Ligand binder design. Sequence first.
Ligand SMILES: COC1=C(OC)C(=O)C(C/C=C(\C)CC/C=C(\C)CC/C=C(/C)CC/C=C(/C)CC/C=C(/C)CC/C=C(\C)CC/C=C(\C)CC/C=C(/C)CC/C=C(/C)CCC=C(C)C)=C(C)C1=O
Ligand SMILES: CCCCCCCCCCCCCCCCC[C@@H](O)O[C@H](CO[C@H](O)CCCCCCCCCCCCCCC)COP(=O)(O)OCC[N+](C)(C)C
Ligand SMILES: CCCCCCCCCCCCCCCCC[C@@H](O)O[C@H](CO[C@H](O)CCCCCCCCCCCCCCC)COP(=O)(O)OCC[N+](C)(C)C
Ligand SMILES: NC(=O)C1=CN([C@@H]2O[C@H](COP(=O)(O)OP(=O)(O)OC[C@H]3O[C@@H](n4cnc5c(N)ncnc54)[C@H](OP(=O)(O)O)[C@@H]3O)[C@@H](O)[C@H]2O)C=CC1
Ligand code: SF4
Ligand code: SF4
Ligand code: SF4
Ligand SMILES: [Zn+2]
Lengths: 63, 342, 156, 115, 96, 176, 144, 208, 386
Amino acid sequence: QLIAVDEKLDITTLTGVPEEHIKTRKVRIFVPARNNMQSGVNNTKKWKMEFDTRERWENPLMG
Amino acid sequence: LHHALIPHGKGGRSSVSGIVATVFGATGFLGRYVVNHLGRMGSQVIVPYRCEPYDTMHLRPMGDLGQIIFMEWNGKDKDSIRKVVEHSNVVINLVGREWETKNFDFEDVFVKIPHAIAQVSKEAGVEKLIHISHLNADIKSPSRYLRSKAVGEKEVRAAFPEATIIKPSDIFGREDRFLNYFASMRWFGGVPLISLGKETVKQPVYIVDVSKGIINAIKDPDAKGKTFAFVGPNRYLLFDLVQYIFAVAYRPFLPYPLPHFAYRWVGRLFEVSPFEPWTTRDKVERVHMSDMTLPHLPGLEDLGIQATPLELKAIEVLRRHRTYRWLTSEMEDVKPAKTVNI
Amino acid sequence: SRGEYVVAKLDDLVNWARRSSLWPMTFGLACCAVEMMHMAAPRYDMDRFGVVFRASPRQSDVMIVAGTLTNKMAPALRKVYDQMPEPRYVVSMGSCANGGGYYHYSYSVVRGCDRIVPVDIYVPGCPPTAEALLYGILQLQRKIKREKRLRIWYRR
Amino acid sequence: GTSVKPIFSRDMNEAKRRVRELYRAWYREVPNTVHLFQLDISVKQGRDKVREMFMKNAHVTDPRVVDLLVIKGKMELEETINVWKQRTHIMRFFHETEAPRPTDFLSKFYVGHDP
Amino acid sequence: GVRTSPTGEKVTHTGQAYDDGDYRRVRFSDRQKEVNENFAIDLIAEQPVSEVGSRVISCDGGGGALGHPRVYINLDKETKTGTCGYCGLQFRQPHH
Amino acid sequence: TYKFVNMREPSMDMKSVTDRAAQTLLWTELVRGLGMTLSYLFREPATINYPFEKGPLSPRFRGEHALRRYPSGEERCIACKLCEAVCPAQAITIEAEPRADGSRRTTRYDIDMTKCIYCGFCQEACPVDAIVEGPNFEFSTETHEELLYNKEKLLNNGDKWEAEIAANIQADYLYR
Amino acid sequence: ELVQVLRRGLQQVSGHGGLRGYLRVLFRANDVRVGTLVGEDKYGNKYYEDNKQFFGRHRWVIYTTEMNGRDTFWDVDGSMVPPEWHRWLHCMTDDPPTTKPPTARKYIWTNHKFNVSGTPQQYVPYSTTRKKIQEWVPPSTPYK
Amino acid sequence: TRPTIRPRNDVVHKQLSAFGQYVAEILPKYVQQVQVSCFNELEIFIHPDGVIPVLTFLRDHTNAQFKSLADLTAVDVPTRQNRFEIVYNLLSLRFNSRIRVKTYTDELTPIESSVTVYKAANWYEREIWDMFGVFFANHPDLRRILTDYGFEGHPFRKDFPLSGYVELRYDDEVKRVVAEPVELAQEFRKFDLNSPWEAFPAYRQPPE
Amino acid sequence: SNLTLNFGPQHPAAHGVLRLVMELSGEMVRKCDPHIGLLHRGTEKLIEYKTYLQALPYFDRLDYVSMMCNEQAYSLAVEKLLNIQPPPRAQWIRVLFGEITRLLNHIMAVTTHALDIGAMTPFFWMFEEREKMFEFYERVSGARMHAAYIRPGGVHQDLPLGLLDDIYEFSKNFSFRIDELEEMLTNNRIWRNRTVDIGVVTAEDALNYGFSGVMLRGSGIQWDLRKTQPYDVYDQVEFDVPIGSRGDCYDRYLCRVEEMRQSLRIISQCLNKMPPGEIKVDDAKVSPPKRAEMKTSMESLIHHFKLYTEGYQVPPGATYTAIEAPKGEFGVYLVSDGSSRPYRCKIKAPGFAHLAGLDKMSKGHMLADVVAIIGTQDIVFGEVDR
Ligand SMILES: COC1=C(OC)C(=O)C(C/C=C(\C)CC/C=C(\C)CC/C=C(/C)CC/C=C(/C)CC/C=C(/C)CC/C=C(\C)CC/C=C(\C)CC/C=C(/C)CC/C=C(/C)CCC=C(C)C)=C(C)C1=O
Ligand SMILES: CCCCCCCCCCCCCCCCC[C@@H](O)O[C@H](CO[C@H](O)CCCCCCCCCCCCCCC)COP(=O)(O)OCC[N+](C)(C)C
Ligand SMILES: CCCCCCCCCCCCCCCCC[C@@H](O)O[C@H](CO[C@H](O)CCCCCCCCCCCCCCC)COP(=O)(O)OCC[N+](C)(C)C
Ligand SMILES: NC(=O)C1=CN([C@@H]2O[C@H](COP(=O)(O)OP(=O)(O)OC[C@H]3O[C@@H](n4cnc5c(N)ncnc54)[C@H](OP(=O)(O)O)[C@@H]3O)[C@@H](O)[C@H]2O)C=CC1
Ligand code: SF4
Ligand code: SF4
Ligand code: SF4
Ligand SMILES: [Zn+2]
């Protein structure tokens, strides 16, 4: 009926994410800034969560 | 460091390791493992092949798109060797035939070809040259194989002074001739052993260990002029080694002594075949010769590798030789063989 | 010389025998296999080229990977490739089998069958027309014709 | 309070009991798996791998999360018993083809920009 | 109008060419390098200049619906020719 | 409105019963099937003699991609990147910069033929008829790398197939 | 009804240039049909049509025995038809280039090439973009 | 207004509204909300505990005989406290109508399985568990259906990456197919297509 | 203990990539356990990552046997969410090509089923007709099977000037091909022995298990979405719905043959009644303008740019739209959040429910009976796995 759990919520073990992408990632929670090229404000209404940028390299074929 | 050769990525398939390797003899037993380990890291591999291109098909999935380039070459032609190593910053030499053929004697395979490769690589500006010889390579050896190995090693050292030289000893693996060769003897029904194999000591080494040793020697700056001995952790008598081989395969063991002259005569008879010989006088000499001990040379443990014991990776090779009855038998129910260690 | 002529003639004969009778395995995964069916249809009639489907891998010469190769299916494709006796050839059909295609970025799709098996001929399209796959099969026949096994053995 | 409802276990003790049942089942199954799948590992290797996978998430203190983990463990055990898994799926627990990533600061600094 | 690098490699219209020490040139060994020999810049350079008696002209690339979107070019500047944004054709107003 | 497909009963008069017994004992319908197969045996087969004959196609057929030019020789592409934005498979990769004469042109135009789904959206989105899907379909390769087209390969394709691509567009541009 | 068929067969035999030509066409194209010569290629291909046959078999090509550099007596392929005859042969139009020639352009290839896969003329992909980041070049003069 | 605009149907709207009121009156213990969309589709938002009763009623009541379960799926909305939204689509052949039932759940709260009401749900619920991680309480046989054997995570989740975490390749040294961390030769290119100007004034939300 | 066998993926009768684990006593079947997901490519997540136009190509692929019907179902959903309406000519073209697609799917379903039963010749005879219908597809769109012709605003291009005549020529002769098929199959006693009283499903069980299409009509249930909930112009054509009596494989085979005949009837009606006019909705904010106007008009160029870069926005809302696809009720539950990319797109394929009910359908039967039951359900695994 009601077990009254007194623990902080934590679902890290059920999501299937490798621990490298849990203990090392740093997420950013923000309202995106308005694109200064335009005057419309419709893209500054909702909050967004993103991740830190990682390495991007040039693949030897086709660049 | 030639910016286009700066390492990038997490070391995976699409990653760049900044290595450009020309692997001579990549279509053999050790060559496939070396190419696989090179392609795992994202290295660029140039495979010079002389065989049918079909016979190189198994090397295609080993690398990413464009990371494995196949080129035709001729051993006796220097221009082909120049063409295949003109852009590589490391050259690995794995060319070698266990038997003598009508067009390529042991001198051609172990002395002339390695010397030409080393000379052309030095002239082309190749930074690193890995050469493979035998642990038992001696100039006084009764085997033409090992005498040629020693002479070719000396020539390679003379032509490429900063060449890393590796001396393995009877590599065993899935495609090896060493484990299979003993297993193959059961068809005759009697295992002929010179002096019952009671005066021959063997120190076989795992194939993955040798490939990892080559890879770690490529990336080790202080392994330029060094010579390495790649041997296993345990030493076995030949009799006990063959006993363990037949026990793992679950086959009846019937070993009998054969005089040296009779074994040499039998080896000669097999040698006459147009196709590759099951055994040859040279093979008889090499397989009944104790493995040399060289405590003054570095080994796998000096490259960060713990040698894999035979008892761990022997079932993966000999399970194929079991019958249907014993096909499902486990690994730890064979009571490993006795090791004469020091 | 004399041995060179004999090995060249024998190699030509064996290459012709292997080229004229190609037995693909009945193995289709997705949309492209429908086009494969249309090759067996009367209009194109692959049978007249010596190409006849056979079910068991042990009696097959060529694998045509016609469709998407998912992660769940890759072990089965590799297994039925390993059970084909040599000589064997692989023909990759369509964008999905070539490089992932429309599902290249999916979490459950292998980006090209060349990660699992070596491939001889890549046939592009989504799906390739029955004529495109017929052209691919004829190109595979030409490639088989070019191969030189006995000559290479003789010069060993 | 919190108006939460359990899946199977009311408290921590029932969850631990189910965990021990799952551990017994996996421990029993390991030798049969080694025989059927023709694995090259020993029974001890499989059993200590099972122990390691169990201990990988031994920090959980929520009975509901423990119940869900036990359910997933039962799913994997049923997949292994019925030979729905193949040899590759079983060996994917061992990561035999992956280079060991370094854990110290200096090697990570040498290798790349990833912390 | 193709050039040749010091290593004997053709230079593409985008100007790309591998350095002397670049290992990627090994991908062209026993093969060839794909280069289009009809360089567009020289081809559009040889086109003559159209003389029109208007301050504003219109260009659609030729062919009507088979050309580019129709644009208008101002020809009031005397020391310069009006150039189409899409086609690259040049127009001018009569002088001298 | 509906009809029944298997809701008929057979008449039980002695003539019909004897006819059914004759059918059972003498295999009349099996002979009818054999006759149908025999009739198909004596017809002309619908097989064409490929590669000496080809199946019919249409001007709207989508095949190998190509990049076209203006009659003056200038490239039509202006690097608007609409084809790249519309591609459902993300198979187009474009990099551009001002040319030496100031034109807005690409420095990289890559199409992954193994990612492409050959949908033709790219030639729909293009505003200058720069990128097209040509008529060719016999371009199988022996390696994966040969199906990764760069700008030079696509321009060569355009130069090679323009004589027919222009005719195909002329025969269908009024439907677009 | 039967002698007429045999006479048609003998007429087909005679219409290819005798027994040698009949055997050549039989062993090269696996078909001994005779039709009106619509045209001849620049490379030697001969294009025939016969409207009495059903759709798909009313237009065919006899390929040349020698293309640009390779012998093509036996190994022919469908990539050797030039684009104009490619458009005609695939029933994309009712008119041959001998009646409706294609528009002439200076940049169009004057020599068609077949599929060059597996040959030293195969296309090798590469990046067409210049270098992104330029490095610093240290001076060659010693600093002390 | 005539040629290009979809025409409205007022009669079906009235019928669906009346039937929604009827259902809400019959089952006040579970029904939280009723809606009729402008293209004449009827939705009933209920409490998670009422999945078995409501459906049973909608399957068995004489005035509402929805004997066919067309679909059963879940929707992931991370910003809600109850993450997953379970949707049942039912079809009534007797009255030629369609109805929708919606409920909610989170990562850890189970939902009663409706295999007793509809056999068709048997696989559908499995699919949900495979791709969203929603556990169904009394499912006779609940396991992965679409994903690979031993596949970790639930792909149809907003936080799950498009290309996953592992990719497969054949390794010759071990002679089998192995899974390794994903490494794309070309990264998926993210496009920001949203316009900065409001498109539909009718759906504007209050700025609080 | 029962013997356990793997049926598929690499099997002739596995119908693609289906792994079936069966417990057999002898050749009796004790339990069938279908294992799917060997063709699961994560279509729905990818659709979440594309625009409404970019996601259209995915739909043809879900069921690669009847591609045009899939696009139409999706198009109807997007049009309903957009609150717009295609022109009459577009709707008539849609219904005509939907009937052609039904013909293709039925020919494929009947012939493959016969092939599995062992009757090889019928498949060869009808695939020439399938090739002709592929020619029609390629002429109208440029691709033989993945046309992407039917758009969420109508169709892409108008018909070529000589297409209706060729469609009439094909339709006036298809009946004799159907008759030859029926001569070879319908009255054959081997065929009846193989199909009669095999895989019998009752009406109540078929309804509860989620069956649709012929799998309903074979049990006597009078249900067809083109008659009860018509969508495009199906209320302006007349045809009959075949109804079975026994619920076995034979009744469903007869129903499929009669459905082919009725679709020929509908094709004749569509050919006679095709109206003139435009082919896509005359709203440049949803459907792209003509290429002639995009190159002369500023508004047209702006709208073409914004349609092919960003795409049209769809007002927020959720819909479930279902059509009577040849394999059954094919539905899409589409959820929009006011963006130009769909928030959620759940695809309902009748093969899912049919394959789920296969285990109940194969109770007390043999192995060859199970092969027949797999054949009779008209299963394609692209739509099953998605
Ligand atoms: C819609 O959803 C889907 C499906 O749903 C239906 C699917 O199904 C599906 C899967 C579909 C694919 C797998 C493609 C499958 C294609 C179709 C299903 C069928 C197409 C072709 C069929 C197989 C029809 C075949 C029937 C015909 C009759 C073909 C002919 C059959 C042959 C086998 C008969 C002849 C056999 C061969 C010719 C071999 C015989 C040759 C001999 C053995 C050799 C000669 C014998 C010698 C040994 C003689 C030796 C003696 C010597 C002395 C002679 C002289 C020698 C000396 C040197 C002189 C997919 C993907 C799918 O998506
Ligand atoms: C046990 C008794 C038998 C012993 C072995 C003999 C078996 C019979 C040999 C059969 C001979 C026929 C083989 C080739 C037929 C000629 C066809 C010709 O076209 O082949 C060309 C070239 O063929 C080869 O050059 C000939 C192969 C045979 C070479 C001679 C072998 C002699 C047999 C010797 C056996 C024993 C030797 C003695 C030592 C023991 C290439 O053709 P291809 O391009 O593909 O097809 C064109 C396709 N088109 C029509 C669509 C355009
Ligand atoms: C006692 C009498 C018993 C008779 C029994 C009844 C009849 C049995 C005969 C069986 C008939 C077989 C079919 C014959 C069709 C003829 C095919 C021929 O026209 O094609 C030629 C095939 O030529 C072959 O040489 C003929 C092979 C036919 C005999 C094989 C039948 C197997 C039984 C005996 C095998 C011994 C073969 C010895 C010759 C190689 C063309 O090939 P080729 O001229 O090359 O061109 C390629 C080489 N080029 C490129 C340099 C020009
Ligand atoms: N295998 C062992 O037990 C250990 C071997 N090592 C040494 O390591 C080297 C490789 O080992 P391994 O892989 O086992 O031997 P392999 O026989 O398996 O590999 C031989 C390779 O060398 C090529 N090759 C052989 N001869 C020539 C030639 N005349 N011209 C050109 N290429 C040739 C082969 O090409 P192709 O196949 O196309 O003919 C092949 O690619 C050898 O030099 C061997 O002596 C020494 C200790 C023992
Ligand atoms: S390449 Fe295209 S047609 Fe072929 S299987 Fe993939 S999606 Fe289907
Ligand atoms: S045809 Fe379609 S998938 Fe291919 S490049 Fe053009 S838009 Fe992209
Ligand atoms: S090909 Fe056309 S659409 Fe693509 S960038 Fe060039 S001009 Fe723009
Ligand atoms: Zn212009």
